[PDB]
Design an enzyme around this catalytic site. Sequence first.
Site, PDB file in Angstrom:
ATOM      1  N   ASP A   1       0.942  -1.228  -0.005  1.00 55.32           N
ATOM      2  CA  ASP A   1       0.069   0.090  -0.113  1.00 55.32           C
ATOM      3  C   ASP A   1       1.037   1.126   0.082  1.00 55.32           C
ATOM      4  O   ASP A   1       1.138   1.834   1.075  1.00 55.32           O
ATOM      5  CB  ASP A   1      -0.941  -0.072   1.171  1.00 55.32           C
ATOM      6  CG  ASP A   1      -1.997   0.914   1.359  1.00 55.32           C
ATOM      7  OD1 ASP A   1      -2.005   1.838   0.409  1.00 55.32           O
ATOM      8  OD2 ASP A   1      -2.882   0.873   2.054  1.00 55.32           O
ATOM      9  N   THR A   2       1.042   2.065  -1.126  1.00 51.19           N
ATOM     10  CA  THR A   2       1.817   3.098  -1.419  1.00 51.19           C
ATOM     11  C   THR A   2       1.245   4.063  -0.568  1.00 51.19           C
ATOM     12  O   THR A   2       1.926   5.326  -0.538  1.00 51.19           O
ATOM     13  CB  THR A   2       2.285   3.354  -2.654  1.00 51.19           C
ATOM     14  OG1 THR A   2       0.969   3.409  -3.615  1.00 51.19           O
ATOM     15  CG2 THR A   2       3.102   2.165  -3.264  1.00 51.19           C
ATOM     16  N   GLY A   3      -0.101   4.242  -0.444  1.00 52.52           N
ATOM     17  CA  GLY A   3      -0.985   5.313   0.159  1.00 52.52           C
ATOM     18  C   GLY A   3      -0.935   5.302   1.590  1.00 52.52           C
ATOM     19  O   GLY A   3      -1.480   6.154   2.269  1.00 52.52           O
TER      20      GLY A   3
HETATM   21  C1  LIG Z   1     -12.660   1.413  -2.771  1.00 52.82           C
HETATM   22  O1  LIG Z   1     -12.050   2.261  -3.022  1.00 52.82           O
HETATM   23  C2  LIG Z   1     -11.303   2.723  -1.691  1.00 52.82           C
HETATM   24  C3  LIG Z   1     -10.158   3.649  -1.925  1.00 52.82           C
HETATM   25  C4  LIG Z   1      -9.368   4.130  -0.900  1.00 52.82           C
HETATM   26  C5  LIG Z   1      -9.766   3.711   0.360  1.00 52.82           C
HETATM   27  S1  LIG Z   1      -8.690   3.878   1.767  1.00 52.82           S
HETATM   28  O2  LIG Z   1      -8.114   5.219   1.567  1.00 52.82           O
HETATM   29  O3  LIG Z   1      -9.418   3.548   2.963  1.00 52.82           O
HETATM   30  N1  LIG Z   1      -7.286   2.971   1.657  1.00 52.82           N
HETATM   31  C6  LIG Z   1      -7.623   1.553   1.603  1.00 52.82           C
HETATM   32  C7  LIG Z   1      -6.666   0.691   2.533  1.00 52.82           C
HETATM   33  C8  LIG Z   1      -7.088   0.742   4.045  1.00 52.82           C
HETATM   34  C9  LIG Z   1      -7.190  -0.858   2.430  1.00 52.82           C
HETATM   35  C10 LIG Z   1      -6.032   3.282   0.900  1.00 52.82           C
HETATM   36  C11 LIG Z   1      -4.815   3.475   1.733  1.00 52.82           C
HETATM   37  O4  LIG Z   1      -3.655   3.799   0.778  1.00 52.82           O
HETATM   38  C12 LIG Z   1      -5.139   4.657   2.761  1.00 52.82           C
HETATM   39  C13 LIG Z   1      -5.173   6.121   2.078  1.00 52.82           C
HETATM   40  C14 LIG Z   1      -5.264   7.197   2.925  1.00 52.82           C
HETATM   41  C15 LIG Z   1      -4.097   8.093   3.304  1.00 52.82           C
HETATM   42  C16 LIG Z   1      -4.345   9.006   4.322  1.00 52.82           C
HETATM   43  C17 LIG Z   1      -5.544   9.236   4.684  1.00 52.82           C
HETATM   44  C18 LIG Z   1      -6.652   8.721   4.334  1.00 52.82           C
HETATM   45  C19 LIG Z   1      -6.477   7.465   3.295  1.00 52.82           C
HETATM   46  N2  LIG Z   1      -4.013   4.920   3.547  1.00 52.82           N
HETATM   47  C20 LIG Z   1      -4.179   4.649   4.926  1.00 52.82           C
HETATM   48  O5  LIG Z   1      -5.272   4.228   5.384  1.00 52.82           O
HETATM   49  O6  LIG Z   1      -2.800   4.678   5.611  1.00 52.82           O
HETATM   50  C21 LIG Z   1      -3.102   4.423   7.046  1.00 52.82           C
HETATM   51  C22 LIG Z   1      -1.531   4.414   7.489  1.00 52.82           C
HETATM   52  C23 LIG Z   1      -1.251   5.998   7.775  1.00 52.82           C
HETATM   53  O7  LIG Z   1      -1.091   6.520   6.473  1.00 52.82           O
HETATM   54  C24 LIG Z   1      -1.074   8.026   6.707  1.00 52.82           C
HETATM   55  C25 LIG Z   1      -2.163   8.498   7.140  1.00 52.82           C
HETATM   56  O8  LIG Z   1      -2.387   7.832   8.424  1.00 52.82           O
HETATM   57  C26 LIG Z   1      -2.515   6.501   8.364  1.00 52.82           C
HETATM   58  C27 LIG Z   1      -3.565   5.670   7.849  1.00 52.82           C
HETATM   59  C28 LIG Z   1     -10.782   2.523   0.526  1.00 52.82           C
HETATM   60  C29 LIG Z   1     -11.485   2.224  -0.472  1.00 52.82           C
END
Ligand SMILES: COc1ccc(S(=O)(=O)N(CC(C)C)C[C@@H](O)[C@H](Cc2ccccc2)NC(=O)O[C@@H]2C[C@@H]3OCCO[C@@H]3C2)cc1
Lengths: 99, 99
Positions: free
Chosen positions: A25-27
């Site tokens: 998960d690059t996000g």
């Molecule tokens: C159906 O399409 C979607 C698209 C995106 C999401 S998501 O944003 O919830 N996510 C899905 C994951 C959790 C399976 C993408 C994910 O990359 C999010 C993307 C993201 C990034 C930042 C805020 C919100 C969402 N990142 C994330 O939750 O990271 C956690 C670790 C750390 O990263 C920095 C932020 O604080 C935490 C959260 C869910 C369904």
Amino acid sequence: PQITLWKRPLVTIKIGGQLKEALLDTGADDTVIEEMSLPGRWKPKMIGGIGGFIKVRQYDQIIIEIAGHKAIGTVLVGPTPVNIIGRNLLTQIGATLNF
Amino acid sequence: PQITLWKRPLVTIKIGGQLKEALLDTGADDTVIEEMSLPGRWKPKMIGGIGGFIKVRQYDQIIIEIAGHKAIGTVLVGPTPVNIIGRNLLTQIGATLNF
Ligand SMILES: COc1ccc(S(=O)(=O)N(CC(C)C)C[C@@H](O)[C@H](Cc2ccccc2)NC(=O)O[C@@H]2C[C@@H]3OCCO[C@@H]3C2)cc1
Ligand SMILES: [Cl-]
Ligand SMILES: [Cl-]
Ligand SMILES: [Cl-]
Ligand code: NA
């Protein structure tokens, strides 16, 4: 490997001697794993995902294998819809995004 | 390009005539943009992540320019804390994860 994104980039991880599935998960800044037992002390952390903020347990310096690559670093334990490998460990295994 | 993961993989996008910064997010099935107007029909959807679910508007057949690369697909619009380019559009620009 070169992983395309037509399907979820799911890999096998090994933590605590146990195999699990996790999403590359690059996000994600951080690695977040579902409830499990880990050794040592933990510290509190609040993380904000798409739906809001949650409390997790931060374990540092945890041995974890990701797709056959060795990493040692921070693992957050708490309620997540899937295990996610974030950039803190993606950098340890040498991952980049390319287009 | 080859994008490092030492930092968040943020790029400039153009959507609905607007320039925005967004995260290249292999962990996101779908593309999710902060509240804005888009033309055409939409329908409601719920999407879930850490912290739970948010309600979004689903717009189909939207063109987005991602770091200079045009792609078309579904865009979800709602109260996300970050703009996210998900796999449905990453595939179209030929993005891969490499290690
Ligand atoms: C159906 O399409 C979607 C698209 C995106 C999401 S998501 O944003 O919830 N996510 C899905 C994951 C959790 C399976 C993408 C994910 O990359 C999010 C993307 C993201 C990034 C930042 C805020 C919100 C969402 N990142 C994330 O939750 O990271 C956690 C670790 C750390 O990263 C920095 C932020 O604080 C935490 C959260 C869910 C369904
Ligand atoms: Cl770490
Ligand atoms: Cl699509
Ligand atoms: Cl391809
Ligand atoms: Na449309």
